[PDB]
């Protein structure tokens, strides 16, 4: 599955929703990131309705003041500010017969251990243990001539060592020249009675 790096629609935010986001960033509360993935099946006239499979990941924002200030500047519309979300999207995913998307854990052990082992020595909790082999997302706001035109571009970075021969190479677009975001899915179709 290849997604275009640019956004399909412009950002439909109001000034008062954006001001609220910046003000919440100013304090010391807990703000979160969110990545959502969805798969939709055909009609299936035997049981009607299209089966949908969803899963979302929440990545806490660092409590350090400098990172939050950088995020505030990025949302305000400053030129160079790559919002960074570490360990957000999985490169490999599993699509079951019904339910929520599941992570490939067998390949996770191979990637985290073999190659160049990364951290996994600071007594990391079980919440981030199953997320150590994920990719990272960087986001930029190209804006445009006016405030009405505001679009975001995404870009991914492979964990550990790049060009590790475990990665399927990406495309490069036939109109803009930017890489395509890639996800590999393992569809399960042999369903039960």
């Amino acid at each position: 599955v290849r997604f275009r790096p640019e956004s399909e629609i412009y950002w439909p935010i109001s000034q008062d929703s954006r001001n609220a986001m910046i003000d919440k960033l100013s304090r010391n509360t807990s703000v979160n990131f969110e990545v959502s993935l969805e798969f939709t099946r055909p009609y299936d006239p035997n049981e009607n309705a299209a089966l949908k499979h969803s899963k979302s990941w929440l990545v806490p924002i660092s409590l350090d003041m400098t990172i939050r200030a950088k995020i505030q500047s990025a949302l305000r519309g400053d030129p160079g500010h790559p919002i960074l979300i570490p360990q957000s999207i999985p490169a490999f995913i599993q699509v079951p017969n019904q339910g929520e998307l599941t992570l490939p854990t067998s390949i996770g052990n191979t990637i985290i251990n073999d190659g160049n082992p990364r951290i996994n020595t600071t007594g990391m909790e079980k919440s981030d243990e199953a997320r150590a082999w994920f990719d990272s997302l960087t986001l930029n706001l190209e804006q445009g001539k006016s405030q009405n035109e505001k679009m975001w571009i995404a870009t991914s970075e492979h964990p550990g060592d790049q060009n590790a021969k475990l990665w399927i190479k990406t495309a490069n677009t036939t109109y803009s020249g930017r890489p395509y975001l890639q996800v590999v899915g393992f569809i399960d179709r042999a369903f039960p009675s």
């Binding site: 299936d44 495309a171 899915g185």
Partner: protein, 48 residues
């Protein structure tokens, strides 16, 4: 052994078709999404 044969023929695990529509969204919680994208196609030939 007729009930056993009936059950074995009646189980008959089936199959379902592959997805055609995939969506992705990136957002800060509690706000309109910052990015959203679509990847449609049924011929399984386009790059998307």
């Amino acid at each position: 052994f007729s009930p056993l044969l009936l059950w074995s023929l009646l189980n008959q695990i089936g199959t379902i078709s592959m997805p055609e529509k995939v969506t992705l969204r990136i957002s800060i919680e509690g706000y309109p999404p910052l990015y959203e994208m679509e990847a449609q196609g049924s011929n399984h030939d386009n790059a998307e």
